[PDB]
Design a protein around this ligand. Structure first.
Ligand SMILES: Nc1ncnc2c1ncn2[C@@H]1O[C@H](COP(=O)(O)OP(=O)(O)OP(O)(O)=S)[C@@H](O)[C@H]1O
Ligand SMILES: Nc1ncnc2c1ncn2[C@@H]1O[C@H](COP(=O)(O)OP(=O)(O)OP(O)(O)=S)[C@@H](O)[C@H]1O
Lengths: 24, 684, 55
């Protein structure tokens, strides 16, 4: 008789940047 | 065999009486029962912002079942509450959990609509592994399972607008937060329960206090749960006060002091004083024991009243005849009359004391819950408030109208006379700088809170550009600036009774003023994550210079009022006119007289002498030297800082030259006496 | 709507009012043992049985 385990399955997000772009 | 291995019969707990008076909510439970007696989409699910007690409405359903206040078709039923963590915890082998769930579902099928299955916290059942969504999808499909769901709005919107079939097996019940008065009724029922628990009396003005003030001063949670907090922690506070007592503690400290002192004396007569204070303490302690016995009898008679209520409810559920009436009719003649005899005996005897939770307990739990100072005036704070002009002219000389307006703002705060649409009192300051604007706000902060920076001093030169509004409110979601929020909303939402200075405001770019328009009108304000923060217990003060030529030209030969109108028109030409309309009052500063200058010099000398005594060096001074500092440190064009730096020069440079010469003996009074044009330090 | 009407069908109102009334007066009359609550109980139980049978 064999039992189970529990796994990680881990990773991160994906990010953004954002850029002002000045007028004058 | 399988069912009670994991389920909780709440209707048994209603029979056990361990549940609570669920008050109101009848339309809601009716609509619940409506969704129960459908053909398809039978499964209800409760939705609301948390605190509104979805658990409570389920248990009130169960109580109305056991009472038989339901209609007939759902009488004789079951409502059994199912943990999942009960289910999981032994699932070592594979399939074990799934066999558990399968046996539970088949035994629910065997009950044949006897059971209203109730599952709290429903989005767990979304994720357990497939796990239960597909693995109740047959029971979803058949409707023989009549599951009742419970969630926050969010995990509904997270997890249940993700599946379609799971969505269309469950029916939204938007449970609302109640108003003031339904909450008041709920509080009266649980007031009865809390006096059953916590050995108290609770007054109905304390209930209306809890409702009103938690509706004002708690911007976090919602009704009724904040009022539950207020009442329960006031119950704890009265319990601890009666468990203490302070006068006993004072007398115990006194007698152990006199005991130690007499044992050091072992003429005494402190023997006699010790014995007298011990007699006094024993008398008051015996009074304390008698009061404890009185309240203990009160608790016993209330508890036996509650046991009689439980028994007569057993007789109402089962249908006992005449035993219940005989029990009631014999019983609470005598328990009512000696309850009132104990009540008037305690109203006599409680000295050392309080048993009624009043508003004052609520206010103290408020002003130590967050800490907006709403409690009524204990006098050291009050008499400190009443000297406020002298308090500020401990540190800020002159600028008297400003001092007055600030003290008026503080007073209209503490009187409770501020309109809670708005912050307490907003200010723009004016005048050419170095006349004590930022220092006045720091002096306020030193007063009210006992620090300079424990206040929010954000100079505006950080904010000269359009984009850096995110330095204060923050980043919108889904970026890197998502884990440190804002900074302004943070430094309110920690401690919402705080001074916020935004010094030198008109450098900034006016979308910062768009933010600040929302600030000064309404005081709720959208933070970075997509929620809001109170401002209504802050004070926001900004500064400027912008009538600098005007005030340095024209503070003579004018009043205060037309001066105000003139420089107000100047700032009208600067800002938008809303942002000077939003101010509680603009206060205009002035050029300075030499008496203020001399007082400033005194203040800086006191600071200097503080630093030197910390160094360990000791000074008397010529005040002709102070006069020459006054005559040299003056200008109309700036004010105080050139005085400060001229004094800095003409003392501290040759002085520190002599100090780091290894020249001046510590301990000697360093006579700062004049030279012909310098000012000498001698050692005599 | 069908569930609403089903619940309206599934229970009376005034019958339950009078049922609470008669069990209250039963409690009260047993507490008496002047009475005349005997007569009032008989009247209200007759009314109760009438409306019950109509239901
Ligand atoms: N009408 C009411 N009668 C009695 N207790 C109530 C009532 N409304 C709220 N409560 C109490 O409010 C507290 C919290 O209520 P809940 O709505 O159950 O909390 P919640 O926000 O639903 O989060 P959970 O998941 O239920 S713990 C409980 O202790 C309830 O007893
Ligand atoms: N009434 C006063 N009491 C004590 N110090 C004062 C007073 N008026 C001016 N000062 C001094 O002058 C300076 C005032 O500091 P601040 O308040 O920063 O100047 P301000 O009036 O705020 O204008 P800015 O923006 O700083 S130029 C400090 O160096 C104070 O020591």
């Amino acid at each position: 008789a064999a039992a189970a385990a529990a796994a990680a399955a881990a990773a991160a997000a994906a990010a953004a940047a954002a850029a002002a772009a000045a007028a004058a | 065999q399988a069912l009670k291995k994991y389920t909780i019969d709440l209707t048994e707990r209603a029979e056990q009486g361990k549940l609570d008076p669920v008050i109101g909510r009848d339309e809601e439970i009716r609509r619940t029962i409506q969704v129960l007696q459908r053909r398809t989409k039978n499964n209800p699910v409760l939705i609301g912002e948390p605190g509104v007690g979805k658990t409570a409405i389920v248990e009130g359903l169960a109580q109305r079942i056991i009472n038989g206040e339901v209609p007939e078709g759902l009488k004789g039923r079951r409502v059994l509450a199912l943990d999942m963590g009960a289910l999981v915890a032994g699932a070592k082998y594979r399939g074990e959990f799934e066999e558990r769930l399968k046996g539970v579902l088949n035994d629910l099928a065997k009950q044949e609509g006897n059971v209203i299955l109730f599952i709290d916290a429903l989005h767990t059942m979304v994720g357990a592994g497939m796990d239960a969504g597909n693995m109740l999808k047959p029971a979803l499909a058949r409707g023989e399972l009549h599951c009742v769901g419970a969630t926050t709005l969010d995990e509904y919107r997270q997890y249940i607008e993700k599946d379609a079939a799971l969505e269309r097996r469950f029916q939204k019940v938007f449970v609302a937060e109640p108003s003031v008065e339904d909450t008041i009724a709920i509080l009266r029922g649980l007031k009865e329960r809390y006096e059953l628990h916590h050995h108290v009396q609770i007054t109905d003005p304390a209930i209306v206090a809890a409702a009103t003030l938690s509706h004002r001063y708690i911007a976090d949670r919602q009704l009724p749960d904040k009022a539950i907090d207020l009442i329960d922690e006031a119950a704890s506070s009265i319990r601890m006060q009666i468990d203490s007592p302070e006068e006993l503690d004072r007398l115990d400290r006194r007698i152990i002091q006199l005991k130690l002192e007499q044992q050091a004396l072992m003429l005494d007569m402190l023997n006699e004083e010790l014995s007298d204070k011990e007699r006094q303490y024993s008398e008051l302690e015996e009074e304390w024991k008698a009061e404890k016995a009185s309240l203990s009898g009160t608790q016993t008679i209330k508890a036996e009243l509650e046991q009689a209520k439980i028994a007569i409810e057993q007789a109402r559920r089962v249908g006992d005849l005449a035993r219940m009436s005989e029990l009631q009719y014999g019983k609470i003649p005598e328990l009512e009359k000696q309850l009132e005899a104990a009540t008037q005996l305690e109203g006599k005897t409680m000295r050392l004391l309080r048993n009624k939770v009043t508003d004052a307990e609520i206010a103290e739990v408020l002003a130590r819950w967050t800490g907006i100072p709403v409690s009524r005036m204990m006098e050291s704070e009050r008499e400190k408030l009443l000297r406020m002009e002298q308090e500020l002219h401990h540190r800020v000389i002159g600028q008297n109208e400003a001092v007055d307006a600030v003290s008026n703002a503080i007073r209209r705060s503490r009187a409770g006379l501020a309109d809670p649409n708005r912050p307490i009192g907003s200010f723009l300051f004016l005048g050419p700088t170095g006349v004590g604007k930022t220092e006045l706000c720091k002096a306020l902060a030193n007063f009210m809170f006992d620090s300079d920076e424990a206040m929010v001093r954000i100079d505006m030169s950080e904010f000269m550009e359009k984009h850096s509004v995110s330095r204060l409110v923050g980043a919108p979601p889904g970026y890197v600036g998502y884990e440190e929020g804002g900074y302004l909303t943070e430094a309110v939402r920690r401690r919402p009774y705080s001074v916020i200075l935004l010094d030198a405001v008109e450098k900034a770019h006016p979308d910062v003023f768009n933010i600040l328009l929302q600030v000064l009108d309404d005081g709720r304000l959208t933070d970075g994550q997509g929620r809001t923060v109170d401002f209504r217990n802050t004070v926001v003060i900004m500064t400027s210079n912008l009538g600098s030529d005007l005030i340095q030209e024209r503070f003579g030969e004018l009043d205060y009022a037309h001066m105000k109108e003139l420089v107000l028109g100047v700032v009208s030409h600067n800002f938008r006119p809303e942002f000077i309309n939003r101010i509680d009052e603009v206060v205009v500063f002035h050029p300075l007289g030499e008496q203020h200058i001399a007082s400033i010099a005194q203040i800086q000398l006191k600071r200097l002498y503080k630093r030197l005594e910390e160094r360990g060096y000791e000074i008397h001074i010529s005040d002709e030297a102070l006069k020459l500092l006054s005559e040299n440190g003056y200008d109309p064009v700036y004010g105080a800082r050139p005085l400060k730096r001229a004094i800095q020069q003409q003392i501290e440079n040759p002085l520190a030259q002599q100090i780091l010469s290894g020249e001046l003996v510590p301990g000697k009074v360093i006579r700062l006496e004049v030279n012909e044009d310098r000012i000498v330090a001698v050692q005599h």
